Scaffold this active site. Sequence first.
Site, PDB file in Angstrom:
ATOM      1  N   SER A 140       0.841  -1.200   0.000  1.00  0.00           N
ATOM      2  CA  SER A 140       0.000   0.000   0.000  1.00  0.00           C
ATOM      3  C   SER A 140       0.864   1.233   0.000  1.00  0.00           C
ATOM      4  O   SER A 140       1.951   1.311   0.608  1.00  0.00           O
ATOM      5  CB  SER A 140      -0.842   0.019   1.271  1.00  0.00           C
ATOM      6  OG  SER A 140      -1.673   1.182   1.323  1.00  0.00           O
ATOM      7  N   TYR A 154      -2.757  -0.567  10.153  1.00  0.00           N
ATOM      8  CA  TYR A 154      -2.742  -0.881   8.748  1.00  0.00           C
ATOM      9  C   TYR A 154      -1.420  -0.478   8.044  1.00  0.00           C
ATOM     10  O   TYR A 154      -0.781  -1.335   7.367  1.00  0.00           O
ATOM     11  CB  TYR A 154      -3.902  -0.227   8.039  1.00  0.00           C
ATOM     12  CG  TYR A 154      -3.979  -0.592   6.593  1.00  0.00           C
ATOM     13  CD1 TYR A 154      -4.362  -1.858   6.194  1.00  0.00           C
ATOM     14  CD2 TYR A 154      -3.643   0.325   5.600  1.00  0.00           C
ATOM     15  CE1 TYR A 154      -4.422  -2.178   4.857  1.00  0.00           C
ATOM     16  CE2 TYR A 154      -3.682  -0.025   4.228  1.00  0.00           C
ATOM     17  CZ  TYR A 154      -4.074  -1.254   3.882  1.00  0.00           C
ATOM     18  OH  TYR A 154      -4.119  -1.571   2.540  1.00  0.00           O
TER      19      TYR A 154
END
Lengths: 245, 219
Positions: A140, A154
């Site tokens: 990501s 995350y």
Amino acid sequence: HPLQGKVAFVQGGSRGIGAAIVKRLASEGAAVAFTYAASADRAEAVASAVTTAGGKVLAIKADSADAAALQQAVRQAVSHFGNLDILVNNAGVATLGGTEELALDDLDRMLAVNVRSVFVASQEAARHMNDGGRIIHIGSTNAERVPFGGAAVYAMSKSALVGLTKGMARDLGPRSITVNNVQPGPVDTEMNPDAGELADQLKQLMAIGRYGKDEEIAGFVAYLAGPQAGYITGASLSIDGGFSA
Amino acid sequence: HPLQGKVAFVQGGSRGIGAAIVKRLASEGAAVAFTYAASAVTTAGGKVLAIKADSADAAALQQAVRQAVSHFGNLDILVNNAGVATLGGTEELALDDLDRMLAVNVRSVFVASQEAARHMNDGGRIIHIGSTNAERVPFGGAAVYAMSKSALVGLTKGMARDLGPRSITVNNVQPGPVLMAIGRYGKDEEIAGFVAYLAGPQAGYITGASLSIDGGFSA
């Protein structure tokens, strides 16, 4: 057909980005084995997109939080198609929560799926991979830019892949296996649709002004899995519409 | 032929990586103008135009871009591949060598990018050819060269923001040699294939990025 005669394993292949990856690798000539956690119906539709078009596929039900399952899935893929050429690690879990609020179960599930299972799949696949192979993690852009609260765990789980990719590139480089970390930005999927106020707020942070498309992530993954990409290794490669500029 | 009907400009296109980039973009259907170092050469009915221009000469670069656009119309793609590498320690490097690396590696990248941007279609592509020495400088002697290449990181980021409303992407391809994880140097055709991918219609969501193609030199 740049992937003719190649064998690919995709961890998390049944929806969104994963489904697009499976179909694109198959369209380039690869036999594809993929894992799915949730829906046999959805994995059937993916398996049929490959086969109606002439490609070869194996759909394997496997929970990316279980060590034993991923190892087993890799071996079952190898039984079916032979040694691997390509591994794509696309499992991913997102829970939002502030540092002071996030539940330890949620922390644990993001670590299990986003980190632990990436290594475990990589290890088993490497044990059954041809020299000249390709390992592609799907990370990501949040490894590089975290502009809001609620994403600490995350983002940690995703920046973890940076060091994993570097060290794995060293380990496997003598076998001419490349290892890379693809870092997407927001991508239009059923669970994260390009619609609504959250989406608008993310688009504002992006140079391009729209969410990325599943097929665009797939395109890049397929380029990295192919015969032109043997010199790309160890890299964290952003495909995020300028989110992290 | 995914670049059929598109127009590319390659700053520094006559040998090595530049030549491979020219050849690959032309093979995918693009019209290609490139500079090498007013004089130009082309072929009747061909779509490749070679223009002699020193990348340190601002007027020659601006003129070259304008010549390309005269032949082929607005650009879709620019690749900035000019480059000079002089080794020297901080204490010893001649200031004229500093100046040459800044002029070619940094200043001419902006000059060509500005002129291209003024004559570029929305949906276009700007690709800078930087270096993995922007991230890893393992030996002495490369400080100014490294500086000239890590400059392209902030340029890429800021140009991506400037041009993103026109759907023009801007990226920085960072080659290593053409310390290695993979045990060989890169092939010019490999660098070219990555540029070609970024230049093409599947890469519209990649922008602002510094993308390493270095055999794991920087791992």
